[PDB]
């Protein structure tokens, strides 16, 4: 029933699977392309930091898919919402998804994608709607 939820899950799960495996509507297409360009950039620029992060989380938890969602909740806990945060969290999700596949090629990224989508859509719904959803995301990052 939830259009925004399904759309978001489609985009985020597709990105995480592409990233984890390394192989590949119109609004969704543009969003995914933007996510690829910006997200691959976050991962390139912050690879060292991301590597440092995932280990710490692993020592405390891993095993629980919910590890990432809590990190997301903490990021947003100062009451600020922006697309930089949203794309950075998705990018870190892709980094974690890559790691999970590296350990086990039959790992599924779907629970991770759902976790990320749940936080964004359920807890930031009206912000997303006001900001024109995934269309706004594309327009925020488009340069030329």
């Amino acid at each position: 029933e939830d259009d925004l939820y399904r759309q978001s899950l489609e985009i985020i799960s597709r990105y995480l699977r592409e990233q984890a495996t390394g192989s590949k509507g119109a609004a969704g297409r543009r969003a995914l392309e933007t996510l690829r360009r910006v997200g691959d950039g976050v991962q390139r620029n912050h690879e060292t930091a991301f590597q440092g992060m995932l280990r710490k989380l692993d020592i405390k938890n891993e095993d629980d898919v919910k590890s990432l969602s809590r990190v997301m909740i903490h990021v947003f806990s100062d009451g600020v919402t922006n697309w930089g945060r949203i794309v950075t969290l998705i990018s870190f999700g892709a980094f974690v998804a890559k790691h999970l596949k590296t350990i086990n090629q039959e790992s599924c990224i779907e629970p991770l994608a759902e976790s990320i989508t749940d936080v964004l859509v359920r807890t930031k719904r009206d912000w997303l709607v006001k900001q024109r959803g995934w269309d706004g995301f594309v327009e925020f990052f488009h340069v030329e």
């Binding site: 903490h74 990021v75 100062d78 600020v80 870190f92």
Partner: peptide
């Protein structure tokens, strides 16, 4: 910490994109 130092890279990306 992990929280604040994701929230560094996110806000200081957000404020590249004004």
């Amino acid at each position: 910490a992990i929280x604040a130092x994701l929230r560094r890279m996110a806000d200081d990306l957000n404020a590249q994109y004004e």
